[PDB]
Amino acid sequence: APPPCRCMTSSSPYQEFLWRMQRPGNIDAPSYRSLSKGTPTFTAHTHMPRNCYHSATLCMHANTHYWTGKMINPSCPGGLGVTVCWTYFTQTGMSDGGGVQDQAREKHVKEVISQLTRVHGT
Amino acid sequence: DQVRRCLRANLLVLLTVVAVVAGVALGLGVSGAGGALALGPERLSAFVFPGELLLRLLRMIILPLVVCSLIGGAASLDPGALGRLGAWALLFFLVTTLLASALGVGLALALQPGAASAAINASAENAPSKEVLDSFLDLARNIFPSNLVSAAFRSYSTTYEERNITGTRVKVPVGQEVEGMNILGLVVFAIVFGVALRKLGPEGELLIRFFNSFNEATMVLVSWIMWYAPVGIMFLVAGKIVEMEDVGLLFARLGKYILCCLLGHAIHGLLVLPLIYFLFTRKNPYRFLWGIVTPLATAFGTSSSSATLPLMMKCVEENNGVAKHISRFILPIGATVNMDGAALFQCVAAVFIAQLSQQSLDFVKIITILVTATASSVGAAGIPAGGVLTLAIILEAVNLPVDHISLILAVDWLVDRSCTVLNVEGDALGAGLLQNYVDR
Amino acid sequence: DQVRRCLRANLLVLLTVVAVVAGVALGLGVSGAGGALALGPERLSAFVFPGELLLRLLRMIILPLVVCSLIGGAASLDPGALGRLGAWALLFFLVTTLLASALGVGLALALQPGAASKEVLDSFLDLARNIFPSNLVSAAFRSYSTTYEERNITGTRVKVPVGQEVEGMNILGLVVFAIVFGVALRKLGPEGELLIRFFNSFNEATMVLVSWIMWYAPVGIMFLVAGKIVEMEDVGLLFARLGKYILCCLLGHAIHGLLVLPLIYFLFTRKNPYRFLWGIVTPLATAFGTSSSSATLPLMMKCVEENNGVAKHISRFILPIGATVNMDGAALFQCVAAVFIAQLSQQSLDFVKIITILVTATASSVGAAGIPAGGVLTLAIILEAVNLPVDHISLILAVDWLVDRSCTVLNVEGDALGAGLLQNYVDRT
Amino acid sequence: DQVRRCLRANLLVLLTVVAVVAGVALGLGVSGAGGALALGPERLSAFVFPGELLLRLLRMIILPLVVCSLIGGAASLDPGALGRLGAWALLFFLVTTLLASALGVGLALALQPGAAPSKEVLDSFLDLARNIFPSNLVSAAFRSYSTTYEERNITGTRVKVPVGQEVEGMNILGLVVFAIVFGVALRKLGPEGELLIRFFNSFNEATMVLVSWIMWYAPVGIMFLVAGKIVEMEDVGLLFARLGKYILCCLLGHAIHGLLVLPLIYFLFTRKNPYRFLWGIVTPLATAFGTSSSSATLPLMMKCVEENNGVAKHISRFILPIGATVNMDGAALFQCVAAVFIAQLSQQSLDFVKIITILVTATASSVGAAGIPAGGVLTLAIILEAVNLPVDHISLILAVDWLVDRSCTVLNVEGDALGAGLLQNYVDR
């Protein structure tokens, strides 16, 4: 039901180099090996702070749900003004100060509570 | 009258215990005659605000207190003496962590929380995991922070970039600094700066005087906040009880897990650490516990060992009069290193998850889960819900399914508070043993 | 000649005036060949750049100044300052400051000098969260603010509020922390003195730099005014709102002292206030001439001993030392100016914003050491705490030359009336 | 024998040089036996971690060192003498940067190695000016300023307006400027500022002790950095066959500038042996080549210039922190050579005006570039947009970026040290 994701990697290696150099806490230049090469492909981040997107929507890729949105800060992953995709849940034990990933976490835990309470009732 | 003098001397601890009792009673009464549904979300936020305010007041004090206290403590002792005291303290910390972890594993194996397993009750998607080597490298990066100002409010954590989902996923790791105070890096830098100040001389003397005066002013602020603490504790307990829904119905099948966690916490806090204190100091550990009642109750209210560090420091200073330098060097380190309740939580939770999925536990698996629980308890954040990430690392190391983590997060609000109580008790008891050793 | 020395001593005021006039002239000359011309709306931030540089410079030296100044000022108070008399004097001064600010805010909104998203009433908990910051270093550059969502999960239009740290520089929380740290430092004793010396030396170092920025201020003010005239119309409401505002605030604080100090003198002493006023005429006229409370300090002492029944000790306690944070009229100026600026930006400041502004204003009611245009830095601090626009301060600095003498007269009147009340209180005991 | 005593005297130099050589050898050996394909991702990360640890250790102490050293240095001289010294320092920096840029342009033209939101050059200059004067010291301690273009007007009139926002960085330049001004202010005060002077001096001495411990750790980190950088290569043969002329141009220009041009200037103005000074600073040069960052090797440079060579305390602590940010000759030569190489790749002719713009914009970019690894790549976009013919396919420059960046760092720190020695002699005269 969600529309397909259009979240490609960097078109040029320089853009990837630029956004990976200005990420918070960076200490060294990214290696040329780690930069994406060839034809662009789908990519997804495992964590994205709430202060990087104005709004996020669900998208589908390979029968898996992802969040998609537009970045508002060059220090945020993906660059500046680049539509990127990130995973439905953030890393376990990790928080992004609210936002879609957190809201998904509490949604999942409340669904678990509801079904487990129903199990108790039966 | 003698009783009047007794209440006047112990007015704070009685106020704190009455606040806890009144908070539990008020939460139960509001939940029974209503809850989050009878009053709107705005009324709920207004109701729970004073406790959050108390937590914010304690969190405002942590950074200058830890930095100044560790600088003064490291600079007031010889580098060799500081090294010997720190080595013994780390030995004590690891001994307590192993004892708590072993006790937790034994109780979790004896009572079998996941024996019935209800009806599995797991599926949407699977949350991403963090590799073990990446977690240890993250710990090593948080030590020696890159930027001193930036480490005061944010810390390093590695993330991943899932590329080519259909095209042979590679999971390239890319790291970034996320929100959350880097206590450990500041602690390490403070210790190194203190030993450098001692190595310097008279210039170090001027800076030592500066930081000691800053710590004393911070202690005056702590004294003022400690009086407001009971109201915040009451409102935290009441609001957390009211917000949480369907008491008992959750417990009807989680009772085994809750019993395992709380029984391990009670045994470690009433028979293991007091036993070590009695066998090493020949004093009464329960007098020490009585002196530190209200930091334990503040920890119970806040569910954060980092928050309750200033109150524990003051209570250790006035009651059970540990010397200032040894207390101010040991307590900040143990607030981020010694986490006995957390280790017991993670061992019990991992065994419960393993029993949910009907997997054998053998012997080498128990050994590696104990070692990884101990080695990953250090460096864990003192913030509330801080043991979930370390438990996830443990689960990744032990090769168990992760999808049942929601059952662990289901009832973690109370057992996390119990863990905080156990951690702060271990800190205080270690300070007591070290004070008795330096008295001899 | 004496006039040359007089102009040299007031070099800054004349320099600022000539700068405002030249900025207006440059804006008028450029406009007509500007707007859609002079690079168009694009590349506009080139004419106004020196002013933005000045604004950045003023925003830089604010944090250490507020923190260190309030720590030093808070540790300089004393309950032991004559015991009851010092407590009564600070209490009376406190009440006057809180009432003067309330009168100014009320009269400001009452006349509305200006006026040619949605935030609920429960924003007071957000304010209370802001004043007691969770993290001190995060409070140095960012502040808490609640936003709203829509979930459509439990019914429709839930509008659940979730808060996050965005911006604001959170000075108010720092002010509270500075006051508490200062009183704790005084409470400490013979250790606290080293830290007190440290912070006072830091404030002194910060003040020379502030003086340097005040010297750089005219080019930025000129370029600010020039940029502000082109983006709008000069014949437009900006002028009429300045005639409204300068005059409004003037008459405001004037009648303020005229009816407020007299009432407190009477209901407490049952004497004739105009007899007290007639005795201290020539210090008031000296204050009108010099526009500086520091200048008329020797004259108040001479006129107060003989013309009023002050004793030597009570006079030497009220006129000096008491002059710190004494300026009531300055507070009326900054409150009226902040309200005028708020209506200038067409912003709905409903109630919590108003109260926070009033409190910050009473607190910064200090500063200036009493120099002319001494309320401008504290007004800038007020604008910074309330996240109101600061770039429109140049219109306020444009015309302070005339209001400041009125403010000085009000300040010296408050000083003299406070001396009269304290002398009558200690005579009657 | 005296050989062992000599080895004991120069143990640090030997350890760092042997660390660099062993890093090269280990990188080549590991690349021969698998080239990170046999290692795999996890083993590669564990292999390259210790160098990152050394870099983080050196970045940990750069902020307090720069701030305290600059305050003490600015307070250790009179304002007039400091102004004269600064004027000479910036003149030397400008002349050296222009010479390096001209040499790079000439060599790239002679050898001919050639055969997305935008950013206006005026906005880049304004961003540099804004970073010089920070708006928040605590915020400027960990992030910088950069402009952004967005469409806020109607779709009929689509024009790019510049908006401002904060990006991650260090903004070391603004902190340098603020520290210098604060030191001058502290010297303006009398006995009041002496306590602060002693405070900052003590903090600097403690930071120097940490510097000594970290530099004792350094050789292992340098070895692993070099080894990891060598291992990360993919196709050495094809990469060299494509970029050999460009690598030769950059390294030959750097070698000419570091062995002929700067020693000649030093010899004419000092009449001593510049290579003795270079021998004194071997260890910071090798550390700079190991870490590829001028900020990390600044403490070792200050210590070695102060101890091994006869340079006064105030001169080193005032000049070297400034030159570690504003004086970058190697980055200038890099950026000029890369711009000419990219222009020749696109078959775009460069006349006199384009060459002059390349030189001027390269000087401005080198002033604005940061002392972080691969810091000169970012301002290459500014230069390319200034010429506006070379669309930004800087991707061909990379994959050999580490080696040329390392040469740039060595050249920059060498220029800083030579300028410090020249100013020491000029003061001594």
Domain boundaries, chain D: 13-115+117-428
Q: Which of A75, D60, D324 is nearest to B150 (CA)?
A: D60
CA distance C280 to C274: 10
Contact between C167 and C143 (Cβ < 8 Å): yes
Query: What is the DSSP pairing of strand C161-167 with strand D143-150?
Result: unpaired
Least Cα distance to D69 among D159, D176, D145 occurs for D176
Q: Does C53 touch chain D (CB under 8 A)?
A: yes
Show Cβ contacts of residue D224 under 8 Å, excluding neighbours closer than 6 positions. D23, D47, D48, D49, D50, D51, D54
Q: Is C312 on the interface with D (CB under 8 A)?
A: no
N- to C-terminal Cα separation, chain A: 33
Residues D357, D358, D363, D364, CA torsion sign? positive
Q: Helix, strand, coil proportions of chain D in percent (round to 5)? A: 75, 5, 20
CB contact B145 to D (< 8 Å):
yes
The Cβ-side half-sphere exposure at B167, using a 13 Å CA radius, reads 9
Q: Which residues 6+ apart lie within 8 Å of C24 measured at CB?
A: C225, C226, C229, C234
Give the list of residues 6+ apart from residue D353 with CB closer than 8 angstroms, or none.
none
Other C-beta atoms closer than 10 Å to the C-beta of B402 total 16
Q: Is D428 exposed, middle or buried (0-12, 13-18, 19+ CB in 10 A)?
A: exposed
What's the CA gap between C125 and D302, in Å, rounded?
51
C43 touches chain D (CB under 8 A): yes
How distant is the Cα of B419 from the closest Cα of chain A, in angstroms?
Answer: 16
Q: How far is CA B188 from the centre of its chain?
A: 18
Measured over the CA atoms of residue D174, residue D175, residue D176 and residue D182, the dihedral's sign is positive
Cβ–Cβ of C59/D135 closer than 8 Å? yes
Q: State the burial class of residue B285 (Cβ atoms within 10 Å of its Cβ: 0-12, 13-18, 19+).
A: buried
CA B65, distance to chain mean position in Å, is: 17
Q: Record the tokens describing residue D331, joined without a space.
A: 């980055």
For tokens 């080198």, the residue is: D366
State the DSSP H helix or E strand holding residue A83, giving kind and residue range, or none if neither: strand A83-87
Alpha-carbon distance of B379 to B97, in angstroms, equals 13
**Side chain identity, residue C82:** L
Question: What is the Cα gyration radius of chain B?
Answer: 22
Experimental approach was cryo-EM
Instruction: Identify which of D238, D136, B186 has the alpha carbon closest to the alpha carbon of residue C64.
Output: D136
Q: Which two tokens stand for residue B219?
A: 């202690």
Cβ distance B148 to D206 less than 8 Å, yes or no, reads no
For the four alpha carbons of C129, C134, C137 and C143, in that order, the dihedral sign comes to: negative
Choose among C49, C137, C197: nearest Cβ to D138: C137
CA distance A103 to chain C (A): 10
Structure tokens at B305: 């060992």
Q: Which of residues 68-97 of C touch B (CB under 8 A)?
A: none
Report the SS3 class of residue D16: helix
Q: Is C272 annotated as a binding residue?
A: no
- Reduced DSSP (H G I as helix, E B as strand, rest coil) percent helix, strand, coil of chain A, to 5: 30, 20, 50
Q: What span, in angstroms and rounded, lies between the C-alpha atoms of D384 and D112?
A: 18
Chain B residues with CB inside 8 Å of C137's CB? 63, 149, 152-153
Distance, CA of D106 to CA of D253 (rounded, Å): 9
B367: Cβ–Cβ under 8 A, 6 or more apart, which residues? Answer: none
Q: Does A54 touch chain C (CB under 8 A)?
A: no
| B21 and C CB contact within 8 Å | no
**Parallel, antiparallel, or unpaired: how do β-strands B154-163 and B172-179 relate?**
antiparallel
D185–C202 C-beta distance less than 8 A = no
Query: Which residue type, as a one-letter code, is found at position B23?
Result: G
Nearest to B298 by CA among B233, B382, B349: B233
The torsion angles phi and psi of A104, rounded to 5 degrees, stand at -65, -40
**Alpha-carbon gap: B105 to the closest alpha carbon of chain C (Å):** 37
C82: left (phi over 0), alpha (psi -120 to 50) or beta: left
Closest CA to C337 of C290, C371, C294, C386: C386
C324 is in an annotated binding site: yes
C107-117 burial string, b = 16+ CB within 10 Å, else e? bbeebebbeee
CATH no., domain D13-115+117-428? 1.10.3860.10
- What string of H, E and C letters represents the secondary structure of chain C? CHHHHHHHHCHHHHHHHHHHHHHHHHHHHHCCCCCCCCCCCCCCCCCCHHHHHHHHHHHHCCHHHHHHHHHHHHHCCCCCCCCHHHHHHHHHHHHHHHHHHHHHHHHHHHHCCCCCCCCCCCHHHHHHHHHCCCCCCHHHCCEEEEEECCCCCCCCCCCCEEEEEEECCCHHHHHHHHHHHHHHHHHHCCCHHHHHHHHHHHHHHHHHHHHHHHHHHHHHHHHHHHHHHHCCCCCCHHHHHHHHHHHHHHHHHHHHHHHHHHHHHHHHHCCCHHHHHHHCHHHHHHHHHHCCCCCCHHHHHHHHHHHCCCCHHHHHHHCCCCCCCCCHHHHHHHHHHHHHHHHHCCCCCCCHHHHHHHHHHHHHCCCCCCCCCCCHHHHHHHHHHCCCCCCCHHHHHHCHHHHHHHHHHHHHHHHHHHHHHHHHHHHHC
Tokens 């194996």 -> residue: B109
Partners of residue A83 in chain D, C-beta under 8 Å = none
- Determine the distance in angstroms separating the CA of A44 from the nearest CA of chain B, rounded to an integer: 5
Which residue in B has a C-alpha nearest to residue D195's C-alpha? B206
CATH assignment, C2-428 = 1.10.3860
D143 SS3 class: strand
Measured between alpha carbons, how far is D410 from D285 in angstroms, rounded to an integer? 6
Tell whether D155 is within 8 A of chain A (Cβ): no
From the candidates D61, D334, D382, D398, which should be mutated to test the interface with A, based on the most A CB atoms within 10 A? D398
Contact (CB<8Å) A14/D374: no
Q: Exposed (0-12), middle (13-18) or buried (19+): which is D131, by Cβ within 10 Å?
A: buried
The first and second tokens of residue C412, run together, are: 């010296």
The CA distances from residue C151 to A103, A107, B319, in Å, are 10, 12, 51
Does residue A57 sit at the C interface (CB-CB below 8 Å)? no
Resolution (angstroms) stands at: 3.5
Strand ordering across the sheet containing B172-179? A57-61, A64-70, A83-87, A43-45, B154-163, B172-179
**Spatial contact of D339 and D380, defined as CB atoms under 8 Å apart:** yes
Query: Is the CB of A50 inside 8 Å of chain C's CB atoms?
Result: yes
Neighbours of C212 (CB within 10 A): 16
Residue D229 backbone phi and psi in degrees, to 5: -65, -40
Q: Do B125 and A113 touch (CB under 8 A)?
A: no
Cα D393–chain centre separation = 24
Tokens 């005066």 -> residue: B213
| Alpha-carbon distances, residue D355 vs C315, D337, D350, D387, D393 (angstroms) | 75, 11, 7, 9, 20
Which residue among C137, C160, C198 places its CB closest to the CB of B41?
C160
> Exposure string (b/e) for C27-37, b if CB count within 10 Å is 16 or more?
beebbeebeee
The phi and psi torsions of C145 (rounded to 5 degrees) equal -150, 135
Name every chain B residue with its beta carbon within 8 A of the beta carbon of D211. Answer: none
- Residue type at C278? W
Contact B58, B240 (CB under 8 A): no
Interface contact D168, partner A, CB < 8 A? yes
Cβ atoms of D136 and C59 closer than 8 Å: yes
Q: Is D216 on the interface with B (CB under 8 A)?
A: no
Distance CA(D177)–CA(C264), nearest Å, equals 51
Dihedral, CA of residue C46, residue C51, residue C53 and residue C58, to nearest 10: -160
The architecture in CATH of the region B2-439 reads: Orthogonal Bundle (1.10)
Residue in C125, C135, C137 closest to B45 by CB: C125
Q: Decide if C104 contacts C403 (C-beta within 8 A).
A: no
CA distance D199 to chain B (A): 7
Chain A residues with beta carbon closer than 8 angstroms to that of B164: 41-43
Write out the H or E segment, with its range, that includes residue D145.
Answer: strand D143-150
**8-state DSSP, A35:** S
d(CA A93, CA A105): 11
Q: What is the 3-state secondary structure (H, E, C) of chain B?
A: CHHHHHHHHCHHHHHHHHHHHHHHHHHHHHHHCCCCCCCCHHHHHHHHHHHHHHHHHHHHHHHHHHHHHHHHHHHCCCHHHHHHHHHHHHHHHHHHHHHHHHHHHHHHHHHCCCCCCCCCCCCCCCCCCCCHHHHHHHHHHHCCCCCHHHHCCEEEEEEEEEECCCCCCCCEEEEEEEECCCHHHHHHHHHHHHHHHHHHCHHHHHHHHHHHHHHHHHHHHHHHHHHHHHHHHHHHHHHHHHHCCCCCCCHHHHHHHHHHHHHHHHHHHHHHHHHHHHHHHCCCHHHHHHHCHHHHHHHHHHCCCCCCHHHHHHHHHHCCCCCHHHHHHHHHHHHHCCCHHHHHHHHHHHHHHHHHCCCCCCCHHHHHHHHHHHHHHCCCCCCCCCHHHHHHHHHHHHCCCCCCHHHHHHCHHHHHHHHHHHHHHHHHHHHHHHHHHHHC
Q: How far is C374 from C330, CA to CA, in rounded Å?
A: 8
Question: For D142, which DSSP code?
Answer: T
- Could you give the CA distance from residue B151 to residue B66 in angstroms, rounded to a whole number? 13
Q: Is the dihedral of CA D233, D238, D242, D245 positive or negative?
A: positive
Q: Number of residue pairs across A and B with CB atoms under 8 Å? A: 131
Contact D202 B199 (CB under 8 A): no
In sign, the C-alpha dihedral spanning C124, C130, C131, C133 is positive
Nearest CA in chain A to C150: A55
CB pairs under 8 A between B and D: 70
Q: Which among A37, A46, A75 is the top mutation candidate for probing chain B, defined by the most B β-carbons within 10 Å of its own β-carbon? A: A46
Element (H, E) at D199: helix D194-231
Amino acid at C78: D
Residue of B nearest to C197 (CA): B210
Q: Which of C135, C177, C188 sits opposite B153 (nearest CB)?
A: C135
Residues of chain C numbered 118-137 and touching chain B (CB < 8 Å): 120, 122, 125, 128-129, 132-137
Q: Does D203 sit within 8 Å of B210, measured CB to CB?
A: no
Task: Give the whole-angstrom CA distance, residue D336 versus residue C370.
Answer: 56
C322 assigned ligand-binding residue = yes
Contact D114, D249 (CB under 8 A): no
DSSP string, D95-114: HHHHHHHHHHHHHHHHH-S-
Half-sphere exposure of residue B287: CA atoms within 13 angstroms, side-chain side:
10
Q: Which residue of C has its CA nearest to D185?
A: C205
| CA D423/CA D429 separation, integer angstroms | 9
Q: Which residue from B182, D395, B213 is spatially nearest to C193, judged by alpha carbons?
A: B213
Nearest CA among D114, D400, D106 for reference residue D253: D106
Pairwise CA distance, residues B183 & B176, whole Å: 17
Q: Which residues of B touch A121 (CB under 8 A)?
A: 249
D163: three-class secondary structure by DSSP: strand
Pairing outcome for strands A83-87 and A64-70: antiparallel
Distance from CA of A25 to the nearest CA of B (A): 5
Residue D399 main-chain phi, psi, to 5 deg = 70, -10
CA angle B195, B196, B200 (to 5 degrees): 120
Dig out the tokens for D342 from the structure.
Answer: 């990219």
> Quick count: other Cβ atoms within 10 Å of Cβ B90?
15
| Helical segments of D112-193, H only | 121-132, 137-140, 172-188
